[PDB]
Design goal:
CATH class: Alpha Beta
Radius of gyration: 16 Å
Distance between the termini: 8 Å
CATH architecture: 3-Layer(aba) Sandwich
Number of strands: 15
CATH topology: Rossmann fold
Bound molecules: calcium ion
Shape: globular
Number of helices: 6
Order of helices and strands: EHEEEHEHEEHEEEEEEHHEE
Helix content: 10-25%
Length: 279
């Protein structure tokens, strides 16, 4: 299948070179997989989700996304127009308030929830979790991310946006999960992207068009936007039977575009998420 005039990021992940505008993907499109977006919520009623999205848990007064951030990330995972895995099932877990912040204790609770909840869902091709959030180092937070991964969920997390070594941020610094850096449409490391030996992979993160609240769309930038590209890719590959939750991050790294990125400091991987599609 081919989506013409696609968002640049979707084009980038199905191409060996920058500057193309068609997203090439197998028609299976993540069907039978499930992705938990742990964030500000998801506006499930947005037409772009086609009824494939639902809120399953909130830690605040309502389950609505009053912010936009969660809806944007979810769109990049699995909306029709803006998503990597266009037929996946999306589940929303609201651990961030409508200002986009949340206590570590709540974020941990949301991760433990997913490890359990997945056992009540029909996700025959596997389960992914996308975490476009983080803060200062906490061994508790890292440990929660490690538990979620260990339970058989592919965990993808943002490297963070401090233009610094991700070793000082959580859950970015947990080695066992898939830590995602950001690139721009010219194959530069995004100027804000964290780096360091703990990064596993890069994805598109500068000027990413996706869904927003009020049934709208907008472009924003962040390692928050790169993470769902990788989460979406994992769900897509699991559906095709190429990898499993336990080994998806390693498979994505092994099959990536290598050496394409500029402004990567010594000690940081030069690996860009790639779907290897051949028609
Ligand atoms: Ca290349
Ligand atoms: Ca890792």
């Amino acid at each position: 299948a081919a989506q013409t005039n696609a968002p640049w990021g979707l084009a980038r992940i199905s191409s060996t070179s920058p500057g193309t505008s068609t997203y090439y993907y197998d028609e299976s499109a993540g069907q039978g997989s499930c992705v938990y977006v742990i964030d500000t919520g998801i506006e499930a009623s947005h037409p772009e989700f086609e009824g494939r999205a639902q809120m399953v848990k909130t830690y605040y007064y309502s389950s609505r996304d009053g912010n936009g951030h969660g809806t944007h990330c979810a769109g990049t995972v699995g909306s029709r127009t803006y998503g990597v895995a266009k037929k996946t099932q999306l589940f929303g877990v609201k651990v961030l308030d409508d200002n986009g912040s949340g206590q570590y204790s709540t974020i941990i609770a949301g991760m433990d929830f997913v490890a359990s909840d997945k056992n009540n869902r029909n996700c025959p091709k596997g389960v992914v979790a996308s975490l476009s959030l983080g803060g200062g180092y906490s061994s508790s937070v890292n440990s929660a991310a490690a538990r979620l991964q260990s339970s058989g969920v592919m965990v993808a997390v943002a490297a963070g946006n401090n233009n610094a070594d991700a070793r000082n941020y959580s859950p970015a610094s947990e080695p066992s999960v898939c830590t995602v850096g950001a690139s721009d449409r010219y194959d530069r490391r995004s100027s804000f992207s964290n780096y360091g030996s703990v990064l596993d992979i890069f994805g598109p993160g500068t000027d990413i068009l996706s869904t927003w609240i009020g049934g709208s769309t907008r472009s924003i930038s962040g390692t928050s936007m790169a993470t769902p590209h990788v989460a979406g890719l994992a769900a897509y590959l699991m559906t095709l039977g190429k990898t499993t939750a336990a080994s998806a991050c390693r498979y994505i790294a092994d099959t990536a575009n290598k050496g394409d990125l500029s402004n990567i400091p010594f000690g940081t991987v030069n690996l860009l998420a790639y779907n290897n599609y051949q028609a």
